[PDB]
Each structure stands twice: as C-alpha cells, then as structure tokens.
Amino acid sequence: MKPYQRQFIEFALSKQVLKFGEFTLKSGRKSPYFFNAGLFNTGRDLALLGRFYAEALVDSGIEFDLLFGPAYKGIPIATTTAVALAEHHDLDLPYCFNRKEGNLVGSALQGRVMLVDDVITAGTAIRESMEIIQANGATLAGVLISLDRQERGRGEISAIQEVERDYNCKVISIITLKDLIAYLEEKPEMAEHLAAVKAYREEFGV
Amino acid sequence: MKPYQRQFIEFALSKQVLKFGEFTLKSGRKSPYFFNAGLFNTGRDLALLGRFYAEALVDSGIEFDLLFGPAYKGIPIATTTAVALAEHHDLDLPYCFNRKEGNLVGSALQGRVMLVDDVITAGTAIRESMEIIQANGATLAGVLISLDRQERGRGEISAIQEVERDYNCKVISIITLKDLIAYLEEKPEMAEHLAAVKAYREEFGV
Numbered sequence: 297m298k299p300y301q302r303q304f305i306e307f308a309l310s311k312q313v314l315k316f317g318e319f320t321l322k323s324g325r326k327s328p329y330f331f332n333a334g335l336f337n338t339g340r341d342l343a344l345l346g347r348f349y350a351e352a353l354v355d356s357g358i359e360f361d362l363l364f365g366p367a368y369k370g371i372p373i374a375t376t377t378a379v380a381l382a383e384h385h386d387l388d389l390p391y392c393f394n395r396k397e398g399n400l401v402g403s404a405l406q407g408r409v410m411l412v413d414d415v416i417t418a419g420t421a422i423r424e425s426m427e428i429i430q431a432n433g434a435t436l437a438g439v440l441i442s443l444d445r446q447e448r449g450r451g452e453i454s455a456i457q458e459v460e461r462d463y464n465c466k467v468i469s470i471i472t473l474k475d476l477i478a479y480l481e482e483k484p485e486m487a488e489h490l491a492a493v494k495a496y497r498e499e500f501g502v
Numbered sequence: 503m504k505p506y507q508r509q510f511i512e513f514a515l516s517k518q519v520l521k522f523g524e525f526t527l528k529s530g531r532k533s534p535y536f537f538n539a540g541l542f543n544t545g546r547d548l549a550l551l552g553r554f555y556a557e558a559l560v561d562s563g564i565e566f567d568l569l570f571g572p573a574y575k576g577i578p579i580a581t582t583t584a585v586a587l588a589e590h591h592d593l594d595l596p597y598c599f600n601r602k603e604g605n606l607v608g609s610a611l612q613g614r615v616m617l618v619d620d621v622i623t624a625g626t627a628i629r630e631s632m633e634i635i636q637a638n639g640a641t642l643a644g645v646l647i648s649l650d651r652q653e654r655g656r657g658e659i660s661a662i663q664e665v666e667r668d669y670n671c672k673v674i675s676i677i678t679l680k681d682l683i684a685y686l687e688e689k690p691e692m693a694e695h696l697a698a699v700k701a702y703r704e705e706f707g708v
C-alpha cells in the first residue's frame with residue numbers, strides 16, 4: 297500500500313474509528329471490525345480526513361469537475377476534502393451540496409461530479425444524488441469513500457461493484473479490506489486480530 | 503483594521519460576495535451593498551473563508567471549548583473553521599453539528615460553545631441552537647459571524663446587540679461596516695461607493 301494509506305489506517309486506529317471486536321453490521325452480518333467515521337469528531341480529525349480523501353482522489357487520476365456533498369454526512373466530508381484539494385494540491389474545485397436527505401447550494405451543478413461518502417452499505421442513497429445530478433444536467437463520474445469493505449452486498453458482487461454497475465461510475469476508496477490485512481501483517485502484536493479478519497475475508501469477501 | 507480584515511474584504515470583493523448596487527434586505531430596507539456568503543462556492547473559497555473565521559476567533563481571545571455548526575449553512579462554515587484552527591493555529595477543537603433546521607453529531611456537546619453563522623438578520627435561529635446547547639448541558643459562549651452590518655434591527659439596538667443581550671453571549675465578526683468604510687477610504691477609484699455607504703450608515707447605523 298502507499299504511505300498515505302498506511303497513515304490513514306494508523307489515524308483511524310488512533311482515533312478509535314477503526315475498532316476490532318464483535319460488531320453487527322447494518323446487514324445483520326457479524327464482523328470482527330467496524331469503521332465508524334462518526335468518531336472523526338475534532339477539527340484536526342476533519343483536517344486530516346480531508347487530506348486523506350484528497351490524496352486518494354489525486355492518486356486515482358480520475359477526471360472530475362465538481363465535488364458533491366449529499367446531506368447530511370456528505371456535506372462536512374465534501375467541505376474538508378475541497379479545502380484539502382486547495383490547500384495541499386493547489387486545486388480550486390467547485391462544490392455543490394444538496395440540503396436534502398433538491399435544495400442545492402454552492403456552484404452551478406454542471407459537469408463530471410464526484411460524490412463523497414464514507415462507507416457504502418447500499419446504493420439507494422447514491423441513486424437519489426444521481427437523480428438530482430442528472431436533473432441539473434450533470435453526470436455522476438465517481439463516488440469517493442473512506443473504506444471499501446470488499447464483501448458481498450445483496451447479490452453476488454460487492455456493494456461497491458453494485459454501485460459501479462448500477463450507476464455507471466467509478467468508486468475511489470482511501471483504503472480497502474486488502475490494505476487493512478496488509479497493515480496487520482506488519483504488526484506482530486495484533487497477530488490475533490489479523491487471523492480473525494482473514495477468517496472473515498474467506499467467508500464474506502469478494 | 504488588521505491585515506487579515508483588509509484581506510477578507512478584498513477576498514469578498516474579488517469573489518463577488520460583497521457587491522454594491524441596489525439591494526433589498528430581508529428587512530425590506532434598501533442597501534447600497536450586500537454580502538452574499540452563498541457565493542463562496544469553490545474549495546479555495548472555503549479554505550480561505552475558514553482561515554479568516556479562525557483568525558477572527560483567535561484574535562478575539564474569547565475562551566471556548568467546542569465549535570457548533572447549526573444546520574444547514576453552519577455545518578460547512580464550522581467544518582472549514584475547525585480545519586483552519588487545526589492547520590493554521592495548532593488548535594484541535596471538538597465540533598458538534600445539529601442536523602436539524604436535536605439530531606447531534608460530532609463530539610459530546612459540552613462546555614463553552616462557539617456557534618458559527620454568516621450574517622445575523624434575526625435572533626430566532628440562534629435561540630433554537632441555544633436551546634439544544636443548553637438541553638445537553640453546555641453553554642452558548644459566543645456567535646462567530648463574517649460581517650456585522652452595525653445597523654438597527656427590530657428595536658433601538660442592532661441585531662448583533664439583540665443577540666448579545668437576549669442570549670448573554672459575545673458576537674465575534676471577521677469585519678464590521680466600520681471596516682468596510684475604512685477600506686473604501688483607502689481606494690480613490692470607489693469614492694462614489696464610499697459616499698453611498700457613509701450616507702447609508704448615517705440613516706440606519708448604530
């Protein structure tokens with residue numbers, strides 16, 4: 297993995313965003329780990345989070361014209377990501393927010409849009425944003441997320457793959473489950489957690 | 503005025519946020535100028551806006567423990583201000599957002615709270631935030647805004663003074679009408695606008 301990906305994992309662990317134990321997902325599936333972006337709850341957390349989103353976005357090389365934050369959780373994520381693109385990459389991006397869970401604010405909604413999210417569990421929320429995007433003449437180019445859990449969704453493919461197929465876009469993640477596994481292999485002291493996650497990948501992974 | 507205040511005025515003018523002409527305020531009053539924070543609509547705009555809020559906040563010396571962003575417009579403003587405090591002042595502040603125009607997200611709502619706004623036209627929205635703040639055991643210490651227009655509100659005193667009296671808090675602005683007048687006096691080329699604003703201050707100013 298790239299340096300910034302290792303740094304993001306260490307950041308998420310240090311802020312208790314990424315935790316191991318016995319968690320029940322929205323699916324009802326039981327997971328040995330959980331990524332809770334709600335716990336990025338200070339201004340330094342927001343600053344670093346935006347910088348990691350922006351680095352993932354620049355590293356991907358995907359072309360986009362506008363950064364879209366859908367209410368409610370997308371608005372702060374898009375805000376700090378837009379700030380980080382300007383401050384750390386000298387990129388001045390139009391943004392648009394939907395004050396709707398359309399009431400649009402920000403720049404004219406036009407062009408290739410990058411939607412920001414944290415963790416994808418279903419495609420429904422993305423379709424609502426896609427319809428507002430398309431209703432204003434723009435196009436959904438990609439979805440930017442923190443973590444791709446790389447596990448089956450409702451059908452045979454992963455939730456991220458369902459989004460890419462259904463809405464004909466690219467998904468860009470800061471990290472994936474594969475990266476989390478590679479991180480844990482570097483750390484002798486959490487060998488036990490590494491075994492629990494690898495066990496989880498074999499049963500539910502894609 | 504301080505350097506950052508002159509820089510904020512030049513920034514607002516360059517991004518068409520601050521405009522002169524014939525505007526009708528929410529009051530129905532006619533003003534030779536209008537400050538439209540909606541036009542801070544790119545990521546660089548958001549980055550600089552957060553930096554100017556943070557500088558105003560640090561310059562004021564007011565003590566606060568948490569930065570509160572009330573939905574909808576307060577959330578991006580609080581986000582970029584919190585980021586700027588961390589990135590440019592090495593201050594890591596808890597934040598809380600109200601996803602309500604209470605559904606609170608962010609850090610535990612506790613302590614001395616600084617609410618963020620853009621332009622105060624009435625105290626009603628601030629009271630709703632104050633009640634959520636007080637309902638969670640915290641206290642409203644201040645309101646941080648872009649521009650204090652320094653004109654009468656509904657009674658004898660200004661809208662900002664009504665907020666300070668009614669909710670027993672301090673209001674911190676990046677700039678005031680007085681600063682705008684001082685800026686225009688430096689600029690021979692807009693002598694005509696300077697006369698129109700001074701005329702407006704004498705009729706409506708506090």
Ligand SMILES: O=C(O)c1cc(=O)[nH]c(=O)[nH]1
Binds near residue numbers: 322329331333417445
């Ligand atoms: O599947 C989920 O509901 C889920 C998993 C996870 O790691 N994080 C999250 O926010 N939701």
Ligand SMILES: O=C(O)c1cc(=O)[nH]c(=O)[nH]1
Binds near residue numbers: 527528537539621651
């Ligand atoms: O009085 C208002 O409604 C008002 C004035 C101004 O300059 N900006 C704004 O957003 N509202």
